Design an enzyme around this catalytic site. Sequence first.
Site, PDB file in Angstrom:
ATOM      1  N   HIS B  40       0.832  -1.163   0.116  1.00  0.00           N
ATOM      2  CA  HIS B  40      -0.014  -0.098   0.067  1.00  0.00           C
ATOM      3  C   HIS B  40       0.791   1.242  -0.030  1.00  0.00           C
ATOM      4  CE1 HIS B  40       0.048  -0.466   4.527  1.00  0.00           C
ATOM      5  NE2 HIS B  40       0.416   0.798   4.299  1.00  0.00           N
ATOM      6  N   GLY B 142       3.260   5.726   9.989  1.00  0.00           N
ATOM      7  CA  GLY B 142       4.355   5.346   9.572  1.00  0.00           C
ATOM      8  C   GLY B 142       5.145   4.076  10.119  1.00  0.00           C
ATOM      9  N   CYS B 144       4.427   1.119   9.295  1.00  0.00           N
ATOM     10  CA  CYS B 144       4.120   0.093   8.381  1.00  0.00           C
ATOM     11  C   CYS B 144       5.339  -0.564   7.878  1.00  0.00           C
ATOM     12  CB  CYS B 144       2.990   0.432   7.143  1.00  0.00           C
ATOM     13  SG  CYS B 144       1.460   0.434   8.082  1.00  0.00           S
TER      14      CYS B 144
HETATM   15  C1  YLV Z   1       1.044   2.168   8.011  1.00  0.00           C
HETATM   16  O1  YLV Z   1       0.846   2.629   6.766  1.00  0.00           O
HETATM   17  C2  YLV Z   1      -0.376   2.466   8.834  1.00  0.00           C
HETATM   18  C3  YLV Z   1      -0.251   2.194  10.230  1.00  0.00           C
HETATM   19  C4  YLV Z   1      -1.341   2.316  11.137  1.00  0.00           C
HETATM   20  C5  YLV Z   1      -1.663   3.809  10.979  1.00  0.00           C
HETATM   21  C6  YLV Z   1      -1.852   4.239  12.355  1.00  0.00           C
HETATM   22  N1  YLV Z   1      -1.608   2.741  13.518  1.00  0.00           N
HETATM   23  C7  YLV Z   1      -1.428   1.686  12.515  1.00  0.00           C
HETATM   24  O2  YLV Z   1      -0.989   0.658  12.743  1.00  0.00           O
HETATM   25  N2  YLV Z   1      -1.251   1.870   8.030  1.00  0.00           N
HETATM   26  C8  YLV Z   1      -2.605   2.402   7.684  1.00  0.00           C
HETATM   27  O3  YLV Z   1      -2.916   3.440   7.926  1.00  0.00           O
HETATM   28  C9  YLV Z   1      -3.651   1.692   6.890  1.00  0.00           C
HETATM   29  C10 YLV Z   1      -3.491   1.780   5.158  1.00  0.00           C
HETATM   30  C11 YLV Z   1      -4.419   0.907   4.354  1.00  0.00           C
HETATM   31  C12 YLV Z   1      -3.994  -0.550   4.686  1.00  0.00           C
HETATM   32  C13 YLV Z   1      -4.422   1.143   3.108  1.00  0.00           C
HETATM   33  N3  YLV Z   1      -5.031   1.951   7.142  1.00  0.00           N
HETATM   34  C14 YLV Z   1      -5.360   1.708   8.667  1.00  0.00           C
HETATM   35  O4  YLV Z   1      -4.736   1.449   9.352  1.00  0.00           O
HETATM   36  O5  YLV Z   1      -6.451   2.382   8.908  1.00  0.00           O
HETATM   37  C15 YLV Z   1      -7.648   1.408   9.229  1.00  0.00           C
HETATM   38  C16 YLV Z   1      -8.899   2.317   9.549  1.00  0.00           C
HETATM   39  C17 YLV Z   1      -9.599   2.661   8.630  1.00  0.00           C
HETATM   40  F1  YLV Z   1      -9.148   2.397   7.107  1.00  0.00           F
HETATM   41  C18 YLV Z   1     -10.650   3.311   8.434  1.00  0.00           C
HETATM   42  F2  YLV Z   1     -11.612   3.668   7.520  1.00  0.00           F
HETATM   43  C19 YLV Z   1     -11.324   3.488   9.932  1.00  0.00           C
HETATM   44  F3  YLV Z   1     -12.664   4.003  10.073  1.00  0.00           F
HETATM   45  C20 YLV Z   1     -10.513   3.331  10.963  1.00  0.00           C
HETATM   46  F4  YLV Z   1     -11.208   3.286  12.160  1.00  0.00           F
HETATM   47  C21 YLV Z   1      -9.377   2.280  10.832  1.00  0.00           C
HETATM   48  F5  YLV Z   1      -8.737   2.099  11.845  1.00  0.00           F
END
Ligand code: YLV
Lengths: 298, 299
Positions: B40, B142, B144
């Site tokens: 991603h 950050g 990931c």
């Molecule tokens: C690394 O890129 C990052 C790590 C993440 C960010 C904060 N704590 C963590 O562990 N990954 C993401 O942001 C990830 C990217 C996706 C796979 C394209 N998305 C994510 O973790 O958010 C999840 C999420 C969501 F997508 C929602 F729509 C939502 F309403 C949420 F509450 C939610 F947690």
Amino acid sequence: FRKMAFPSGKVEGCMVQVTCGTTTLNGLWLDDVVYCPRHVICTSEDMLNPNYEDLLIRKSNHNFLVQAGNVQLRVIGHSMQNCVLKLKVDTANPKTPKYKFVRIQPGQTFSVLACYNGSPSGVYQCAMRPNFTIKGSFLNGSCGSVGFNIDYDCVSFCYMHHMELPTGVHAGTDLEGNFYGPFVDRQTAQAAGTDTTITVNVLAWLYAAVINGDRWFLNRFTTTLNDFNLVAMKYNYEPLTQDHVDILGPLSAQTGIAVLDMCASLKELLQNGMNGRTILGSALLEDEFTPFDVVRQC
Amino acid sequence: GFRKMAFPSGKVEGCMVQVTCGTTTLNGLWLDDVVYCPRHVICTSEDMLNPNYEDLLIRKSNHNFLVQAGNVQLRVIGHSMQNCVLKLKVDTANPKTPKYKFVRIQPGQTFSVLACYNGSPSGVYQCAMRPNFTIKGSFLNGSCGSVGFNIDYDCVSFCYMHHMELPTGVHAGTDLEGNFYGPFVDRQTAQAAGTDTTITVNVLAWLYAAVINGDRWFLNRFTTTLNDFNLVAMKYNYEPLTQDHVDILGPLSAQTGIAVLDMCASLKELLQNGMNGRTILGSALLEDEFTPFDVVRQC
Ligand SMILES: *[C@@H](O)[C@H](C[C@@H]1C=CNC1=O)NC(=O)[C@H](CC(C)C)NC(=O)OCc1c(F)c(F)c(F)c(F)c1F
Ligand SMILES: *[C@@H](O)[C@H](C[C@@H]1C=CNC1=O)NC(=O)[C@H](CC(C)C)NC(=O)OCc1c(F)c(F)c(F)c(F)c1F
């Protein structure tokens, strides 16, 4: 929140083993000096009450076996500084990080790299208790394992492991060989003072709860530092110092809650209990997360 | 003493790099001449909701990827995708590559996480793969591309790469072949996990640990059969105990002289009555992220 250690690699690159006869413990190799507990020079029989100055006068450089892995490092000098032995060696450690030696205060936390025969086994976060013991996980052969913090590029070494007390807690020195607390490196029965709760860390934990939106315990009042300290001691809480009030500064700024207002909220929790409520999903107040640790995870 | 203990992270720190595509920056794992990172990284704001990864990747060139190891930029000479992991071929080999393997761990197993930001190691801690295939981590924006691992002898077994947070605050990611643990998907949507259960074999190991450290208030002179214990366990959303689990607990049973099923009887009493204010090894809650191996090694 979980206990998170610093990455251990920069310290792993400094661990060696030091042997006298059959007594082997760990040492710390920085530049061309190896630091280790002085009781490496003791026979198991002479640990009852050692005469360290006499034991050392009988020692020569060629009586010390220092190894990085299975590779011998030749000792070219030796001296004793308090309870630590300094062995000058003929090779500067190419993995030496930027480092300093610091003496920490009770309540402060650090990572411990538990080592055996100069090989790292595990890393974990410790807090120095108000009675100058740590609740470590140490087995025979662990002496010379070190405790440290990492700030940017720089490793601050604050602890070197020397002994276990009857109650199962651990004691040791700074890297200048000065024990934390009233302990001595002798195979004699020693007791730590009654422990207390680390107030500054409990406050940090309450600030952390607020930052995460858990704020039922905030009250409308304040207190003086002296009134809070006198009450805190009646609940076996450590009194706050000016340094404690200062290190809570960033969290007070982040939340807009004055330190003395948080103290008033804590006093109410002490005097009235939780009444069946939780804070950060716990009925127990946590005292091993420092204000820095909270910022490290928030 | 008994602390939650992570593996020394030095061998993994030597593999962490920074990987950037567009305005997206996360971590990669550099082993020999290949860098592994979450796919991603190639998304943008408008991509995240329903990313067609094969489509998005064919539109990228090697030069759209910026890989930095410290002050040094590594030239990407090739790229491919394996499930949810992107593999970047670089023109230099990592001299710090440890002996390693890629493994897929089972629920209940533990591993160490090296949390990293902008390719730089930040902290290390121990986690367990939950029965619902989440992990309770400490991961920020950050993080990931941070990895989870175990070390045996001199061999690093990588088992986890980090991809997302769930609304409840737990975390989800993949093995190093890019397959998620659990029913999660690398898209920007709110995802719920299945009902979590408690890892019973680990709670038992942790109770044995408390005994080894002189703490036995919770013990009793009752006994139980394995099946009758498992009936009560399942009632309280604890995983059932297998005979392999009983066997794995042998060494701890030997060391303490406490039969496994006697410890099951103690746990049953704790499940039914609670701790009544008491604590075990300092905890007000029964801990389930120490395996029997973790307990034994540390004792
Ligand atoms: C690394 O890129 C990052 C790590 C993440 C960010 C904060 N704590 C963590 O562990 N990954 C993401 O942001 C990830 C990217 C996706 C796979 C394209 N998305 C994510 O973790 O958010 C999840 C999420 C969501 F997508 C929602 F729509 C939502 F309403 C949420 F509450 C939610 F947690
Ligand atoms: C490192 O050499 C070693 C580590 C120690 C041993 C297992 N867990 C630990 O923390 N340190 C010692 O063995 C140390 C050497 C002395 C200071 C010269 N001695 C020690 O820890 O024994 C503690 C001790 C004791 F001395 C008693 F007399 C006693 F009755 C005890 F119960 C006891 F724990």
